[PDB]
Write a protein that binds this ligand. Structure first.
Ligand SMILES: [Cl-]
Length: 82
């Protein structure tokens, strides 16, 4: 149902970005026309896995560094959170 996970595969743009903001593991904004926008990354969902790597229990700075250092393809598993 509503709590099935979603896998969102994005491609960094020419500036190195997939197009989102997050805080405390939770997506908070999507950049217009970005890969995040076009592949359905959602706010009010938490980041669980990036490129197959479990990121549950990691700090935002750790998530950030995984995102920045990734190759162009960035795949995120997201779940609703409360
Ligand atoms: Cl449901």
């Amino acid at each position: 149902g509503a709590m099935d996970p979603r896998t969102i595969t994005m491609h960094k743009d020419s500036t190195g970005h997939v197009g989102f903001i997050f805080k405390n593991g939770k997506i908070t904004s999507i950049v217009k026309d970005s890969s995040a926008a076009r592949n359905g990354l959602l706010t009010e969902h938490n980041i669980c896995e990036i490129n197959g790597q479990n990121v549950i229990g990691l700090k935002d700075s750790q998530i950030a560094d995984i995102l920045s250092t990734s190759g162009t393809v960035v795949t995120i598993t997201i779940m609703p959170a409360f």
